[PDB]
Design an enzyme around this catalytic site. Structure first.
Site, mmCIF file in Angstrom:
data_model
loop_
_atom_site.group_PDB
_atom_site.id
_atom_site.type_symbol
_atom_site.label_atom_id
_atom_site.label_comp_id
_atom_site.label_asym_id
_atom_site.label_seq_id
_atom_site.Cartn_x
_atom_site.Cartn_y
_atom_site.Cartn_z
ATOM 1 N N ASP A 292 45.317 5.453 -55.574
ATOM 2 C CA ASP A 292 45.773 6.555 -56.432
ATOM 3 C C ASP A 292 44.665 7.434 -56.952
ATOM 4 O O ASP A 292 44.776 7.996 -58.057
ATOM 5 C CB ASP A 292 46.582 6.069 -57.640
ATOM 6 C CG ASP A 292 47.563 4.970 -57.299
ATOM 7 O OD1 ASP A 292 48.049 4.872 -56.150
ATOM 8 O OD2 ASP A 292 47.835 4.176 -58.211
ATOM 9 N N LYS B 4 44.356 10.696 -52.691
ATOM 10 C CA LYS B 4 44.228 10.821 -51.234
ATOM 11 C C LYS B 4 45.252 11.759 -50.565
ATOM 12 O O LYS B 4 44.872 12.561 -49.707
ATOM 13 C CB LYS B 4 44.272 9.429 -50.578
ATOM 14 C CG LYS B 4 43.050 8.528 -50.836
ATOM 15 C CD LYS B 4 43.432 7.050 -50.686
ATOM 16 C CE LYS B 4 44.371 6.666 -51.823
ATOM 17 N NZ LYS B 4 45.237 5.508 -51.548
ATOM 18 N N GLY C 54 51.976 5.254 -52.246
ATOM 19 C CA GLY C 54 52.861 6.283 -52.746
ATOM 20 C C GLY C 54 51.995 7.460 -53.149
ATOM 21 O O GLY C 54 51.079 7.294 -53.963
ATOM 22 N N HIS C 55 52.212 8.623 -52.537
ATOM 23 C CA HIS C 55 51.410 9.801 -52.866
ATOM 24 C C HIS C 55 52.266 11.002 -53.243
ATOM 25 O O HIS C 55 53.320 11.240 -52.648
ATOM 26 C CB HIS C 55 50.523 10.240 -51.689
ATOM 27 C CG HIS C 55 50.235 9.167 -50.684
ATOM 28 N ND1 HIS C 55 49.161 8.314 -50.795
ATOM 29 C CD2 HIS C 55 50.823 8.879 -49.496
ATOM 30 C CE1 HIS C 55 49.093 7.552 -49.715
ATOM 31 N NE2 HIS C 55 50.089 7.877 -48.914
ATOM 32 N N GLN D 265 45.921 2.625 -50.591
ATOM 33 C CA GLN D 265 45.296 1.780 -51.613
ATOM 34 C C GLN D 265 43.841 2.214 -51.872
ATOM 35 O O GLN D 265 43.543 3.407 -51.861
ATOM 36 C CB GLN D 265 45.371 0.303 -51.198
ATOM 37 C CG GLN D 265 46.771 -0.306 -51.240
ATOM 38 C CD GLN D 265 47.654 0.064 -50.041
ATOM 39 O OE1 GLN D 265 47.393 -0.353 -48.910
ATOM 40 N NE2 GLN D 265 48.730 0.802 -50.302
HETATM 41 N N1 LIG Z 1 45.814 17.151 -62.778
HETATM 42 C C1 LIG Z 1 45.570 16.705 -61.549
HETATM 43 N N2 LIG Z 1 46.491 15.969 -60.978
HETATM 44 C C2 LIG Z 1 46.152 15.601 -59.750
HETATM 45 C C3 LIG Z 1 45.001 15.891 -59.080
HETATM 46 N N3 LIG Z 1 45.023 15.310 -57.805
HETATM 47 C C4 LIG Z 1 46.178 14.708 -57.781
HETATM 48 N N4 LIG Z 1 46.939 14.824 -58.903
HETATM 49 C C5 LIG Z 1 48.124 14.186 -59.210
HETATM 50 O O1 LIG Z 1 47.838 12.806 -59.084
HETATM 51 C C6 LIG Z 1 48.802 12.142 -58.297
HETATM 52 C C7 LIG Z 1 48.302 11.869 -56.833
HETATM 53 O O2 LIG Z 1 49.099 10.885 -56.069
HETATM 54 P P1 LIG Z 1 48.486 9.420 -56.381
HETATM 55 O O3 LIG Z 1 49.417 8.283 -56.194
HETATM 56 O O4 LIG Z 1 48.004 9.435 -57.776
HETATM 57 O O5 LIG Z 1 47.202 9.381 -55.399
HETATM 58 P P2 LIG Z 1 47.144 8.769 -53.918
HETATM 59 O O6 LIG Z 1 47.492 9.707 -52.814
HETATM 60 O O7 LIG Z 1 45.748 8.316 -53.733
HETATM 61 O O8 LIG Z 1 48.058 7.608 -53.890
HETATM 62 C C8 LIG Z 1 49.976 13.055 -58.266
HETATM 63 O O9 LIG Z 1 50.917 12.948 -59.321
HETATM 64 P P3 LIG Z 1 51.230 14.503 -59.658
HETATM 65 O O10 LIG Z 1 51.017 14.776 -61.100
HETATM 66 O O11 LIG Z 1 52.606 14.899 -59.286
HETATM 67 O O12 LIG Z 1 50.220 15.370 -58.750
HETATM 68 C C9 LIG Z 1 49.274 14.411 -58.249
HETATM 69 C C10 LIG Z 1 44.029 16.656 -59.680
HETATM 70 O O13 LIG Z 1 42.945 17.022 -59.221
HETATM 71 N N5 LIG Z 1 44.381 17.050 -60.956
HETATM 72 O O1 LIG Z 2 49.333 2.055 -52.722
HETATM 73 C C1 LIG Z 2 48.989 1.481 -53.754
HETATM 74 N N1 LIG Z 2 48.415 2.118 -54.840
HETATM 75 C C2 LIG Z 2 47.891 1.459 -55.942
HETATM 76 N N2 LIG Z 2 47.876 0.141 -56.127
HETATM 77 C C3 LIG Z 2 48.437 -0.478 -55.107
HETATM 78 C C4 LIG Z 2 48.978 0.084 -53.965
HETATM 79 N N3 LIG Z 2 49.469 -0.865 -53.113
HETATM 80 C C5 LIG Z 2 49.212 -1.924 -53.756
HETATM 81 N N4 LIG Z 2 48.594 -1.833 -54.976
HETATM 82 C C6 LIG Z 2 48.277 -2.913 -55.800
HETATM 83 O O2 LIG Z 2 47.848 -4.003 -54.905
HETATM 84 C C7 LIG Z 2 48.361 -5.283 -55.284
HETATM 85 C C8 LIG Z 2 49.046 -6.006 -54.187
HETATM 86 O O3 LIG Z 2 50.192 -5.269 -53.740
HETATM 87 P P1 LIG Z 2 50.898 -5.358 -52.292
HETATM 88 O O4 LIG Z 2 50.162 -4.496 -51.351
HETATM 89 O O5 LIG Z 2 52.392 -4.843 -52.642
HETATM 90 O O6 LIG Z 2 50.982 -6.760 -51.754
HETATM 91 C C9 LIG Z 2 49.133 -5.015 -56.508
HETATM 92 O O7 LIG Z 2 48.199 -4.962 -57.644
HETATM 93 C C10 LIG Z 2 49.539 -3.559 -56.310
HETATM 94 O O8 LIG Z 2 49.925 -3.048 -57.537
HETATM 95 O O1 LIG Z 3 51.213 5.380 -55.701
HETATM 96 C C1 LIG Z 3 51.153 4.184 -55.614
HETATM 97 N N1 LIG Z 3 51.245 3.379 -56.778
HETATM 98 O O2 LIG Z 3 50.311 3.648 -57.800
HETATM 99 C C2 LIG Z 3 51.543 1.934 -56.597
HETATM 100 C C3 LIG Z 3 52.724 1.470 -57.440
HETATM 101 O O3 LIG Z 3 53.544 2.302 -57.881
HETATM 102 O O4 LIG Z 3 52.848 0.257 -57.671
HETATM 103 MG MG LIG Z 4 49.478 6.420 -54.869
#
Ligand SMILES: Nc1nc2c(ncn2[C@@H]2O[C@H](COP(=O)(O)OP(=O)(O)O)[C@H]3OP(=O)(O)O[C@H]32)c(=O)[nH]1
Ligand SMILES: O=c1[nH]cnc2c1ncn2[C@@H]1O[C@H](COP(=O)(O)O)[C@@H](O)[C@H]1O
Ligand SMILES: O=CN(O)CC(=O)O
Ligand SMILES: [Mg+2]
EC number: 6.3.4.4
Length: 431
Positions: free
Chosen positions: A13, A16, A40-41, A224
């Site tokens: 998170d 990416k 989850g992104h 992750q």
């Molecule tokens: N203010 C701000 N927000 C940002 C930035 N980059 C991503 N997000 C916000 O941070 C979250 C990014 O998705 P993730 O799960 O956190 O990351 P990953 O892909 O690694 O799993 C999202 O939630 P969201 O609010 O809808 O807009 C995005 C940034 O530079 N500034």
């Molecule tokens: O995509 C992800 N984003 C952030 N944390 C994660 C993510 N996937 C897994 N984790 C953390 O990794 C651990 C193991 O999760 P698992 O991959 O569901 O088996 C737990 O702490 C999750 O909350």
């Molecule tokens: O975007 C991914 N999450 O932070 C993992 C979760 O919801 O457990």
């Molecule tokens: Mg995420």
């Protein structure tokens, strides 16, 4: 470089999805090489949000072929749920997403196993996303799991599925005293999509080889983050796959010598979802501030993310583990207004020694205390700033200090969620 890798330098998170979406403007291919729907992104374009899990973060660009390589544990239901969500939105998923026949399949019983075990752990539960990622990788490694290519022969698949489900159910009922998973249903459900799944199959390792030879731009996308790596993370408070750079070649089929640039996604502060070691964790008001301001909630489970300051000691493990070429500093804007910001520069070990290296397994992080450098904050708004000139001197110092502490440059700066609220100082592809 032609092949760029973008992964998480902390605990996932870091941001990416946005960066992959942004940088794929020049790429032909995007490849997820590990993980599953645990990821989850949140992508945002012109205010429009898109949340991806199993689908690579370039699925929104028709000029890019998205690919889930062999390293990813694939959930047919998850895939179907995502394809449909996007299709109802104008994204012809089927025509731009290819997949590896080697990907292991995540079926209902893996979720049962995941849950049963997590409950069995009692208080020492991992805080997994309940997606069944663990049990999938387990079946895989045991050489008993089902892969996409098994759907090639529906008759023999069904047989393999019967005995394996048989195997797991004995454990679910007799040992865990939990509900058994019905074979006939998993079979039906899967067979319902068998043809869709198989239609997207390509020999991705050979593909990437051909692409490489032609000099096409490839972007590898990690899920992750580094400290969640199965081998190199805070075991057992980790995920079941290699979230670090080496996972690229294993879960794609591309040869290691062909990684040109590795970009690490670095969030201005730290977060962690799930149980486990978190040195710089904050529990005070600044912790609430961060979570609130950076809307820190799991994109997959919706769980509130533990927040803390940026740990340069931890980031420095990521640097060496992934042979980072550059960083992408994200969510700088979220720190707007703090009276002072802190960086963790070393660790005070439980025995008295001060160190600048991280411990390995979770247990060894037990009494580890963070030693920080305190720097002044900035009241000005950086949100939306697309150029350093709009960045205040404090902000520039923070950035500069991080480079000094890590020895790795910040080639990209992100000041907001939307695709264009970003600053590209050096583009990985031509860099
Ligand atoms: N203010 C701000 N927000 C940002 C930035 N980059 C991503 N997000 C916000 O941070 C979250 C990014 O998705 P993730 O799960 O956190 O990351 P990953 O892909 O690694 O799993 C999202 O939630 P969201 O609010 O809808 O807009 C995005 C940034 O530079 N500034
Ligand atoms: O995509 C992800 N984003 C952030 N944390 C994660 C993510 N996937 C897994 N984790 C953390 O990794 C651990 C193991 O999760 P698992 O991959 O569901 O088996 C737990 O702490 C999750 O909350
Ligand atoms: O975007 C991914 N999450 O932070 C993992 C979760 O919801 O457990
Ligand atoms: Mg995420």
């Amino acid at each position: 470089g032609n092949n760029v890798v973008v992964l998480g330098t902390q605990w996932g998170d870091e941001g990416k999805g946005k960066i992959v979406d942004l940088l794929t403007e020049r790429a032909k291919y995007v490849v997820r090489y590990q993980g599953g729907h645990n990821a989850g992104h949140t992508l945002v374009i012109n205010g429009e949000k898109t949340v991806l899990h199993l689908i690579p973060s370039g699925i929104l660009r028709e000029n890019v072929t998205s690919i889930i390589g062999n390293g990813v544990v694939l959930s047919p239901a998850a895939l179907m749920k995502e394809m449909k969500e996007l299709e109802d939105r104008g994204i012809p998923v089927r025509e731009r997403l290819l997949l590896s026949e080697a990907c292991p399949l995540i079926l209902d019983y893996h979720v049962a196993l995941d849950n049963a075990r997590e409950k069995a752990r009692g208080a020492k539960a991992i805080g997994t996303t309940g997606r069944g990622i663990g049990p999938a990788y387990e079946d895989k490694v045991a050489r008993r799991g089902l892969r996409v290519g098994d759907l090639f022969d529906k008759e023999t698949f069904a047989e393999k599925l019967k005995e394996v489900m048989e195997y797991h159910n004995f454990q679910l009922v007799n040992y865990y005293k939990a509900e058994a998973v019905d074979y006939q249903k998993v079979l039906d459900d899967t067979m319902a999509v068998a043809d869709i799944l198989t239609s997207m199959v390509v020999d991705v390792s050979d593909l990437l080889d051909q692409a490489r030879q032609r000099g096409d731009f490839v972007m590898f996308e990690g899920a992750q983050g580094t400290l969640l790596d199965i081998d190199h993370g805070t075991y057992p408070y980790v995920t079941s796959s290699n979230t670090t750079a080496g996972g690229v070649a294993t879960g794609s089929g591309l040869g290691p010598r062909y990684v040109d640039y590795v970009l690490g996604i670095l969030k201005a502060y730290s977060t962690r979802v799930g149980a486990g070691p978190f040195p710089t964790e904050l529990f005070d008001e600044t912790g609430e501030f961060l979570c609130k301001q950076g809307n820190e909630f799991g994109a997959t489970t919706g769980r509130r993310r533990r927040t803390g300051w940026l740990d340069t000691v931890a980031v420095r493990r990521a640097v060496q583990l992934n042979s980072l070429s550059g960083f992408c500093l994200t969510k700088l804007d979220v720190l707007d207004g703090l009276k002072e910001v802190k960086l963790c520069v070393a660790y005070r070990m439980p025995d008295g020694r001060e160190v600048t290296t991280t411990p390995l397994a979770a247990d060894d992080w037990k009494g580890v205390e963070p030693i920080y450098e305190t720097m002044p904050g900035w009241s000005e708004s950086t949100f939306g700033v697309k150029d350093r000139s709009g960045l205040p001197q404090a902000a520039l110092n923070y950035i500069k200090r991080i480079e000094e502490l890590t020895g790795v440059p910040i080639d990209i700066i992100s000041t907001g969620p939307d695709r264009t609220e970003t600053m590209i100082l050096r583009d990985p592809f031509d860099a």
